[PDB]
Design an enzyme around this catalytic site. Structure first.
Site, mmCIF file in Angstrom:
data_model
loop_
_atom_site.group_PDB
_atom_site.id
_atom_site.type_symbol
_atom_site.label_atom_id
_atom_site.label_comp_id
_atom_site.label_asym_id
_atom_site.label_seq_id
_atom_site.Cartn_x
_atom_site.Cartn_y
_atom_site.Cartn_z
ATOM 1 N N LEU A 21 0.804 -1.215 0.000
ATOM 2 C CA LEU A 21 0.000 0.000 0.000
ATOM 3 C C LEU A 21 0.839 1.268 0.000
ATOM 4 C CD1 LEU A 21 -2.272 -1.892 0.226
ATOM 5 C CD2 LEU A 21 -2.912 -0.885 2.412
ATOM 6 N N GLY A 22 1.957 1.274 0.721
ATOM 7 C CA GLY A 22 2.817 2.436 0.762
ATOM 8 C C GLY A 22 4.155 2.144 1.402
ATOM 9 N N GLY B 78 6.804 4.321 3.487
ATOM 10 C CA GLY B 78 7.205 5.549 4.136
ATOM 11 C C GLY B 78 8.654 5.504 4.582
ATOM 12 N N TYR C 266 9.714 5.121 7.523
ATOM 13 C CA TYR C 266 9.930 4.209 8.637
ATOM 14 C C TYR C 266 9.228 2.867 8.501
ATOM 15 C CZ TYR C 266 11.815 8.356 10.893
ATOM 16 O OH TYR C 266 12.561 9.472 11.196
ATOM 17 N N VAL D 216 3.740 -0.580 4.225
ATOM 18 C CA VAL D 216 2.401 -0.954 4.660
ATOM 19 C C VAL D 216 1.782 -1.858 3.606
ATOM 20 C CG1 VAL D 216 0.198 -0.128 5.506
ATOM 21 C CG2 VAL D 216 2.245 1.251 5.836
ATOM 22 N N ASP E 188 2.412 13.754 14.746
ATOM 23 C CA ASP E 188 2.464 13.609 13.297
ATOM 24 C C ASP E 188 1.057 13.642 12.719
ATOM 25 O OD1 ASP E 188 3.759 13.467 10.880
ATOM 26 O OD2 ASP E 188 3.930 11.276 10.889
HETATM 27 C C1 LIG Z 1 1.782 3.982 8.211
HETATM 28 O O1 LIG Z 1 1.478 3.690 9.548
HETATM 29 C C2 LIG Z 1 0.267 3.015 9.763
HETATM 30 C C3 LIG Z 1 -0.589 2.731 8.709
HETATM 31 C C4 LIG Z 1 -1.789 2.068 8.937
HETATM 32 C C5 LIG Z 1 -2.782 1.715 7.823
HETATM 33 C C6 LIG Z 1 -2.729 2.049 6.543
HETATM 34 C C7 LIG Z 1 -1.641 2.904 5.896
HETATM 35 N N1 LIG Z 1 -0.845 3.546 5.408
HETATM 36 C C8 LIG Z 1 -3.860 1.558 5.650
HETATM 37 O O2 LIG Z 1 -4.635 0.779 6.087
HETATM 38 N N2 LIG Z 1 -3.940 2.085 4.296
HETATM 39 C C9 LIG Z 1 -4.951 1.749 3.300
HETATM 40 C C10 LIG Z 1 -6.025 0.910 3.560
HETATM 41 C C11 LIG Z 1 -6.953 0.637 2.566
HETATM 42 C C12 LIG Z 1 -6.811 1.206 1.309
HETATM 43 C C13 LIG Z 1 -5.741 2.049 1.048
HETATM 44 C C14 LIG Z 1 -4.816 2.317 2.045
HETATM 45 O O3 LIG Z 1 -3.730 3.165 1.798
HETATM 46 C C15 LIG Z 1 -2.124 1.679 10.224
HETATM 47 C C16 LIG Z 1 -1.272 1.960 11.277
HETATM 48 C C17 LIG Z 1 -0.081 2.626 11.047
HETATM 49 O O4 LIG Z 1 0.777 2.903 12.119
#
Ligand SMILES: COc1cc(/C=C(\C#N)C(=O)Nc2ccccc2O)ccc1O
Length: 328
Positions: free
Chosen positions: A43-44, A46, A48, A51, A154
């Site tokens: 998904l991403g 970052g 740190y 995801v 943040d």
């Molecule tokens: C980056 O730090 C955290 C991230 C997350 C959760 C997501 C992110 N990024 C996430 O669920 N994203 C997502 C879900 C569904 C469709 C598109 C999306 O981008 C949770 C706790 C964290 O600490």
């Protein structure tokens, strides 16, 4: 020297908590089963963490797996301990599990799945009611974590997950979050540039929960005024100048004078003199439907140089701006 500062609310919460609560470097991670989770897609990525969307095959439920990038163990356990401390709180992202990832050799945090839509996509279609509703939902998360002795540090749209279909909000990415201890000096290298509080930009380290309220103000300004981001500085110095062109330089000097802070001398030839502006100047025909006297007054009371003068999260929830939001 600089004048010390204390949070005006939740000052001593960590003092009267047991040491186990805030002493995160002594926390003992309880590892789950890494094989319970099948990564579906990334998904991403970052600074740190990376995801991933995943499925917990022990229940066939969608989860989100956050594989941390190699960082100091204190910072990893800080986020874990903070997530476990805040679990169950209103609109706090729920840490479901922690597993050791065999590839990264780093902890993988498993969270509840939030069917998010892109905030760039989302903020284009948010109605006035939508903005007040989600602001109130963010405020629930912020008051909770503040009441639990933790500042997010943040707060920004990327860290606010919104399943707009079910009007569901989650505050995520607690990797920069910290326990607030009275008189502690903190790293000012937190938050994204556009949402950094003036305390960070003037290098004042004895900040507190009120930092999140500035960041929330920056978010609110960007939504109701339809300007992403609101204070659009090119660097940390120009960031303060962007704020000073709105809030005025005289109140800026009042702020640093109150705490005996001295501006970076490089501000001498870039800051200038600026009157404080009225928020109505940012209203136009393309955002007026998102603006109300309550919206401007609420925003005005969040975006204050003096961190000690900003609305606390609880005070913000009392604001008339949220009178129209349906309570549960
Ligand atoms: C980056 O730090 C955290 C991230 C997350 C959760 C997501 C992110 N990024 C996430 O669920 N994203 C997502 C879900 C569904 C469709 C598109 C999306 O981008 C949770 C706790 C964290 O600490």
């Amino acid at each position: 020297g600089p004048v010390p500062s204390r949070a005006r609310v939740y000052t001593d919460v960590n003092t009267h908590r047991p040491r186990e609560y805030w002493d995160y470097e002594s926390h003992v991670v309880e590892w789950g089963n890494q094989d319970d989770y099948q990564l579906v897609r990334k998904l991403g990525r970052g600074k740190y963490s990376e995801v991933f969307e995943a499925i917990n095959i022990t229940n066939n439920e969608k989860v989100v797996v956050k594989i941390l990038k190699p960082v100091k163990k204190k910072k990893i356990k800080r986020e874990i301990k903070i997530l476990e401390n805040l679990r169950g709180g209103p609109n706090i992202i729920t840490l479901a599990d922690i597993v050791k990832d065999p590839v990264s050799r780093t902890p993988a945090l498993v969270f509840e799945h939030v069917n998010n839509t892109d905030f760039k996509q989302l903020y284009q279609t948010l109605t006035d009611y939508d903005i007040r509703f989600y602001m109130y939902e963010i405020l629930k998360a912020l008051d909770y974590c503040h009441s639990m002795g933790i500042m997010h540090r943040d707060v920004k749209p990327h860290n606010v997950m919104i399943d707009h279909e079910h009007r569901k909000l989650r505050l995520i990415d607690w990797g920069l979050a910290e326990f607030y201890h009275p008189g502690q000096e903190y790293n000012v290298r937190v938050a994204s540039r556009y949402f950094k509080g003036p305390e960070l930009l003037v290098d004042y380290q004895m900040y507190d929960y009120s930092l999140d309220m500035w960041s929330l103000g920056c978010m609110l300004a960007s939504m109701i005024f339809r300007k992403e981001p609101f204070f659009h500085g090119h660097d940390n110095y120009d960031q303060l100048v962007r704020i000073a062109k709105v809030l005025g330089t005289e109140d800026l000097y009042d702020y640093i004078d109150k705490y005996n802070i001295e501006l970076d001398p490089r501000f001498n030839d870039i800051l200038g003199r600026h009157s404080r502006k009225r928020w109505e100047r940012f209203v136009h025909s393309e955002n007026q439907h998102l603006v109300s006297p309550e919206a401007l007054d609420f925003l005005d009371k969040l975006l204050r140089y003096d961190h000690q003068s900003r609305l606390t999260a609880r005070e913000a929830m009392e604001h008339p701006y949220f009178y129209t939001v349906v309570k549960d």
